[PDB]
Amino acid sequence: IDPTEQLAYFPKITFERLKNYAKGKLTRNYMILLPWQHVNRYNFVFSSTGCKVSLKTCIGKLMKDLNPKVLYFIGEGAGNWMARTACEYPDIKFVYRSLKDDLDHHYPLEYQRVIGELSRIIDSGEGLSMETTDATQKTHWDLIHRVSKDALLITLCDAEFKDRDDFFKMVILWRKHVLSCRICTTYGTDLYLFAKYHAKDCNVKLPFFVRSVATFIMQGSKLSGSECYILLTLGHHNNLPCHGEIQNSKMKIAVCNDFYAAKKLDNKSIEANCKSLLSGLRIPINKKELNRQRRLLTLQIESKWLTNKANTIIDWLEHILNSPKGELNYDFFEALENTYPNMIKLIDNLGNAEIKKLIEVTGYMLVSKK
Ligand SMILES: C[S@@+](CC[C@H](N)C(=O)[O-])C[C@H]1O[C@@H](n2cnc3c(N)ncnc32)[C@H](O)[C@@H]1O
Ligand SMILES: [Zn+2]
């Protein structure tokens, strides 16, 4: 399968770049309980980070300028971000790493689904220990070159760390590697780390000789959150972004912008996400399909619990069906929620994974309208 052809299943990314008279504060309390950032992620099954972040969109110039032959993806889970990168840059090879709980044979599930094969992942971390897959461990960085002898020009980190200290542990280790490593030193100090960070306190200095070049605030990030992507390099250290700066960019995006839908619809993926939400749910999701699902339940303890869960889902999809076609924005998402009477029953009955799937299906339905 052609990687550039697969790129049409990924939505266009909206973001703000902050390069490193009182400003004023932009506030908007959206009365929402659902993770609406998954609204345009219906074409992806195991992970969907590529719908939020892109290397061509955010750091396209650096990608052009450095021209890496190998990219290093750490804390990458199912590898949807790596999969989008493989579609944007079809000649790039990858070194993949993500924290593993066992010695069992693992592989980025989303990359395999999107790209087809793993031939471009020259190091998938096969046969690696738990610590050798942990970005906060020295051994992880010492075995990063076991296959690839290319310098860490651009390292991508999307790890969801336990505590904020873990982020620093990783950054310090990246710095310690790029300044000791025979391969990386031979290159120079023009080495980059594009890492996920949760901006909380202000005036938090980055480790010694780690400088922030830019901060990226993504539309696809949880609205209540403080998540951003920082582009780091070697040089005189500066401050990390603070919660304040991030919220203002997070708010302008939420208030001003709409979510772009993917140009093409991956029907196999949508059908997979539907069956993941409510087993047996088929596309197109219409009046007929919702009455069919309602008819399956009346044909008849955990038995009453799973049917209660099903009624909750059908009821929500029925509300989406009987709702006007609007633009994909938080003003419309707030209208959708605040016009549904059983919102609190919905969040109580459904689990986090089910609710994320419910929003992906809702998004498919909203895009399908008219
Ligand atoms: C948000 S997911 C990455 C999603 C990825 N960008 C994608 O497209 O699928 C975060 C991943 O980081 C991993 N992780 C958590 N702590 C880690 C650590 N200390 N070192 C490395 N990976 C870690 C988690 O196990 C999880 O798979
Ligand atoms: Zn190195």
Numbering used by the authors: 1616 to 1635, 1642 to 1921, 1936 to 2005
Published text:
The Mononegavirales order groups five families of monopartite, negative-strand RNA viruses many of which are highly pathogenic and/or contagious; the Filoviridae (of which Ebola virus is a representative), the Bornaviridae (Borna disease virus), the Nyamiviridae (midway virus), the Rhabdoviridae (rabies, vesicular stomatitis virus (VSV)) and the Paramyxoviridae (measles virus, human metapneumovirus (hMPV)). These viruses encode a large RNA polymerase (L) (usually >2,000 amino acids) that is crucial to viral replication. As a part of this study, we expressed CR-VI+, a 406-residue fragment comprising CR-VI and the adjoining ‘+ domain’, the variable region carrying the K-K-G-motif, investigated its MTase activity and solved its crystal structure. Besides sequentially methylating the 2′O and N7 atoms of small capped RNAs, CR-VI+ also 2′O methylates uncapped substrates and displays nucleotide triphosphatase (NTPase) activity. Both the CR-VI domain, which assumes a fairly standard MTase fold, and the K-K-G motif of the (mainly helical) +domain are required for the MTase reactions.
Most notably, hMPV and flaviviruses share an unusually long (∼10 residues), flexible β2λ (that is, the loop immediately following the β2-strand), which forms the SAM-binding pocket (SAMP) along with loops β1λ and β4λ, shielding it from the solvent. In CR-VI+, β2λ similarly assumes alternate conformations. In the ‘closed’ form, the ligand’s ribose group is hydrogen bonded to D1725, and—via a water—to D1722. Loops β1λ and β4λ also show a degree of flexibility. β1λ residue E1697, conserved in paramyxo- and filoviruses, forms a hydrogen bond with the NH2 group of SAM and is essential for both MTase activities.
